[PDB]
Amino acid sequence: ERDAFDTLFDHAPDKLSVVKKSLITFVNKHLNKLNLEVTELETQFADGVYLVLLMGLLEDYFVPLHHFYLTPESFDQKVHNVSFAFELMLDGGLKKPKARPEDVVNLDLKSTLRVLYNLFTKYKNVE
C-alpha cells in the first residue's frame, strides 16, 4: 500500500533531509541515555542492535543483552535483531511496521524511516 514516504522518495527528495534530522533527534533523545549516538540513519540501524535497545528505552528498561546479538556475526543474526525489535513493537501495542526486517539490514532507508516514524507517532511525548 502506497503512503507519504513513497511521495517523499519519488517526488520530493528535497524534504528528505528534514525528515532525517528530526528522526535523528528523536532517536538520539533516547539513545543518548545509554551514551549512544546516531548520525546516519541508514547504516547505524542495520545491526538491529540500536533498534532493539531503543525499544527498551521507549518502554523505560534495559533489554537483556542475551536476548539478542550485540555483535551480529552474519546477515541472519542481523535479521533476527530487527525482527526481535519488531516483536517488541507489537508488545508495546503499536501497529506492525509495513517493512520487511531484511530491508532494514539491507540498508533500505525508506523502510528504516517508516519504522522509525511509527515509533515517533506513539512515543512523541516520552521524555
Binding site: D3, A4, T7, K15, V18, V19, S22, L23, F120, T121
Partner: peptide
C-alpha cells in the same frame, strides 16, 4: 497534502 502533514508532524 499527506506528505505535508508528515513533515509538520516531525517539525513539532
Amino acid at each position: 497534502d499527506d506528505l505535508d502533514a508528515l513533515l509538520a508532524d516531525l517539525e513539532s
